[PDB]
């Protein structure tokens, strides 16, 4: 049992209560009780965590990300439109990674993520097809203690239209191999079903498995319908990348949202990612079927895609979470940095300093994010009965001083290093910035290994790591 005491609790509960000098009691992975110190004595606990002078929040929820690609950041990944990045960087880089590289990628990602207060990660696994990768990744997620949705991507249909464009893009890095990860529909089903049977609900309920048809052009109608029915039969969600680029825009003369509507493929268990190339009608169609959304505001900028209509969706009460997207289209895994970006980009583009409140941005990173993953009954707020995914932030630093309104301070001032202590499913995963799965005496050597492995991955893939200085 664990008692967190004397903090300010930012509950994100139904009344958005903010409780000064208050406590939380945790038992068997759950929040069992809460109270105010002046009115009540906290129950006895095996241990007390002192949060005096600190702010307690629900853990941040990364609503859509791609983990293993983190080893491709730091030089190779920037300055390219989506498809250029995909074909010259992501596909070949992923392919050159071995299972032992994956294990290091995952631990590096989880170290950055937990340090920034992320406790749930929706991993869209585009490299699950390669032998050994699932097993390597899953062993590290389990050990680390993070809550993970492992959304297994598949592609079962050739999009032949885009080929002369692809060859031109490939000529930018001709020594880098063009890859294919297409699989037959029935093979994808069997592989995802077996993955779910083996890993879903493992690591004490912390790991889930979803089917992830990649896009409306890369997956057949049958494949998407299978994913849809699978989500329904197993009480999970299914997810798809929607309208991330201007070449996706026209699946057969209508938008991807329209196309899915025609086939009855929009439902309340679908979470779509991106939605940059969206019009009013598309928003209406998602709204009507209660589709969940993950917005990758930073990555949409990094890749030169654009700006999604998040304010419109939010004003319709839609469940919109925030994803950091790829470890190499951001290039950080920092929810607080992404929140600030979500606040500012929309203000700038609408010329409206009040287009999204910092409270609302904080909601997107917590309780609404949970809702976007279909997990809001279990996580995303500090409420009795929910899982004990909790973070303690210290605002006593120069950047976060002064602080009066907590959501404003967090969104507009915090850098992302203010998170001290992190609980996931009631287990202490970080304490005073010390990571339980990467102790301080191993941290530097681990980073050097990740650095070396990245350098080697890029050599095997024939990718340029450090292009010559260019001002224009």
- Binding site listing: 64, 66, 274, 325
Binding mask 152-171 vs a copy of itself (x if CB under 8 A, - otherwise)?
A: --------------------
356 is written with which tokens?
């999204």
Choosing from 100, 184, 246, 315, the residue that interacts with a copy of itself (CB under 8 A) is 315
How many residues belong to the site for Fe ion (CB under 5 A)?
Answer: 1
- Among the listed residues 47, 350, 405, 434, the single contact to a copy of itself using CB under 8 A: 350
| Segments of 110-243 assigned E as strands | 118-125, 147-154, 207-213, 238-242
Residue 22 in 3-state DSSP?
A: strand
In the DSSP assignment, the letter for residue 12 is -
Interacting partner of 350 out of a copy of itself, Fe ion, none (Cβ under 5 to 8 A depending on kind): a copy of itself
**Helix, strand or coil for residue 411?**
helix
Nearest to 156 by CA among 113, 78, 230, 214: 214
List the single partner that 439 binds among Fe ion, a copy of itself, none, CB under 5 to 8 Å by kind. none
The interface partner of residue 52, options being a copy of itself, Fe ion, none and the CB cut-off 5 to 8 Å by kind, is: none
Closest approach of Cβ 318 to a copy of itself, in Å?
10
Pairing of strands 207-213, 238-242: unpaired
The yes or no reply on residue 348 touching a copy of itself (CB under 8 A) is: no
Of residues 96 and 257, the one with the C-beta less far from a copy of itself: 257
User: Which of 252, 281, 397, 405 forms a contact with a copy of itself (CB under 8 A)?
Assistant: 281
- Asked if 349 touches a copy of itself (CB under 8 A), the answer is no
Of the two residues 356 and 435, which places its CB atom closer to a copy of itself in the complex? 356
Q: Is 352 in the site for a copy of itself (CB under 8 A)?
A: yes
Residue 371 contacts residue 12 (beta carbons within 8 Å): no
Residue from 48, 311, 417, 437 that binds a copy of itself (CB under 8 A)?
Answer: 311
Distance CA 73, CA 63 (A): 20
Bridge-partner residues for 118, per DSSP?
60
DSSP H helices, 324-439, are: 335-350, 358-365, 367-372, 406-412
Give the per-residue contact string, 316-355, with Fe ion (x = CB under 5 A; - = no).
---------x------------------------------
* Furthest CA-CA distance within the chain: 70
Choosing from 161, 316, 396, 397, the residue that interacts with a copy of itself (CB under 8 A) is: 316
Is 325 or 363 the residue whose CB approaches Fe ion more closely? 325
Cα Rg of the chain (Å, integer): 22
Residue 54: C-alpha distances to residues 114, 358, 404 (Å): 17, 19, 13
Residues touching a copy of itself, count (CB under 8 A): 11
Can residue 337 be called a binding residue for a copy of itself (CB under 8 A)?
Answer: no
Minimum CB distance to Fe ion smaller for 248 or for 325: 325
If you search the block for the tokens 């509960």, which residue do you land on? 13
Question: Does the footprint of a copy of itself cover residue 284 (CB under 8 A)?
Answer: yes
Give the residue numbers of the binding site for Fe cation. 64, 66, 274, 325
Which residues are within 8 A (CB) of 462 and not within 5 positions of it... i.e. 6 or more apart?
92, 173, 175, 176, 177
CA distance 118 to 369: 12
Of 297-305, 348-356, 392-400, 437-445: span binding a copy of itself (CB under 8 A): 348-356
Closer by beta carbon to Fe ion, 275 or else 424: 275
Q: Which does 311 bind (CB under 5 to 8 A by kind): a copy of itself, Fe ion, none?
A: a copy of itself
Selected from 37, 287, 347, 403, the binder of a copy of itself by CB under 8 A is: 287
State how far the Cα of 320 lies from the Cα of 292, in Å rounded to an integer: 6
Sign of CA dihedral 281, 283, 287, 289: positive
Q: How far apart are CA 385 and CA 40, in angstroms?
A: 19
Phi, psi at 223, each rounded to 5°: -65, -45
Q: Which stretch binds a copy of itself (CB under 8 A): 91-99, 290-298, 310-318, 419-427?
A: 310-318
- Quote the least distance from Cβ 284 to a copy of itself, whole Å: 7
Shortest separation between residue 300's beta carbon and a copy of itself, angstroms: 20
Helices (H) and strands (E) in the chain — how many of each? 16, 18
Query: Least Å distance between CB 361 and a copy of itself?
Result: 16
Dihedral sign computed on CA atoms, order 382, 308, 117, 196: positive
CB of 281 to a copy of itself, least distance (A): 5
Q: By C-beta, is 149 or 345 nearer to a copy of itself?
A: 345
Residues whose CB is less than 8 angstroms from the CB of residue 258 and which lie 6 or more positions away in sequence, other chains included: 281, 282, 285
Q: Which does 161 bind (CB under 5 to 8 A by kind): Fe ion, a copy of itself, none?
A: none
Smaller CB distance to a copy of itself: residue 62 or 295? 295
Opening angle at CA 270, ends 267 and 274, nearest 5: 125
- C-alpha 10/C-alpha 12 separation (Å) is 6
C-alpha span between 239 and 291 (Å, rounded): 10
Residues 353-392 that bind a copy of itself (CB under 8 A): 355
Q: Which residues here bind a copy of itself, judged by CB under 8 A?
A: 280-281, 284, 287, 311, 315-317, 350, 352, 355
Q: Which residues here bind Fe ion, judged by CB under 5 A?
A: 325
């Amino acid at each position: 049992t664990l008692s967190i005491q004397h903090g300010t609790l930012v509950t994100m509960d139904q009344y958005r209560r903010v409780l000064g000098d208050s406590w939380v009691h945790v038992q068997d992975g759950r929040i069992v009780a809460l109270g105010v110190h002046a009115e009540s004595v906290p129950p006895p606990a095996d241990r007390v965590i002192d949060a005096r002078g600190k702010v307690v929040l629900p853990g941040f929820i990364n609503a859509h990300t791609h983990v293993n690609q983190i080893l491709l950041r730091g030089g190779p990944s920037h300055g390219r439109q989506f498809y250029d990045w995909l074909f010259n960087v992501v596909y070949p880089g992923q392919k050159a990674m071995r299972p032992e590289d994956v294990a290091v990628a995952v631990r590096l990602y989880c170290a950055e993520a937990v340090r920034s207060g992320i406790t749930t990660i929706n991993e869209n696994a585009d490299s699950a097809i390669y032998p050994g990768n699932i097993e390597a990744a899953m062993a590290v997620y389990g050990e680390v203690g993070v809550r993970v949705v492992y959304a297994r991507m598949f592609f079962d249909r050739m999009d032949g239209r885009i080929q002369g464009y692809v060859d031109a893009l490939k000529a930018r890095s001709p020594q880098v191999e063009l890859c294919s990860i297409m699989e037959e529909t029935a093979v994808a089903k069997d592989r995802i079903t077996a993955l779910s049977d083996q890993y879903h609900g493992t690591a004490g309920g912390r790991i889930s498995v979803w089917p992830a048809p990649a896009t409306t052009t890369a997956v057949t109608v049958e494949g998407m319908r299978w994913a849809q029915a699978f989500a329904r039969d197993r009480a999970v969600m299914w997810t798809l990348h929607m309208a991330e680029s201007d070449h996706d825009e026209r699946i057969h003369g209508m938008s991807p949202a329209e196309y899915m509507e025609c086939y009855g493929l929009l439902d309340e268990r679908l979470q779509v990612a991106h939605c940059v190339y969206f019009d009013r009608k598309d928003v209406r169609l998602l709204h009507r079927h209660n589709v969940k959304v993950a917005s990758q505001v930073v990555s949409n900028a990094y890749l030169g895609s654009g700006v999604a209509p998040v304010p419109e969706m939010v004003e319709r009460g839609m469940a919109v979470g925030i994803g950091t997207d790829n470890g190499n289209s951001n290039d950080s895994v920092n929810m607080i940095g992404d929140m600030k970006f979500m606040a500012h980009i929309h203000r700038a583009v609408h010329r409206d300093a009040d287009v999204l409140t910092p409270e609302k941005i904080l909601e997107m990173a917590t309780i609404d994010g949970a809702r976007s993953l279909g997990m809001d009954h279990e996580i995303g707020s500090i409420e009795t009965g929910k899982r004990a995914d909790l973070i303690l932030l210290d605002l006593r630093h120069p950047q976060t001083t002064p602080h009066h309104h907590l959501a404003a301070t967090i969104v507009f001032q915090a850098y992302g290093n203010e998170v001290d202590t992190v609980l996931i499913d009631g287990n202490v995963v970080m304490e005073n910035r010390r990571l339980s799965f990467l102790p301080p005496e191993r941290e530097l050597a681990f980073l050097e290994e990740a650095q070396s492995r990245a350098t080697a991955i890029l050599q095997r893939a024939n990718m340029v790591a450090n292009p010559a200085w260019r001002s224009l």
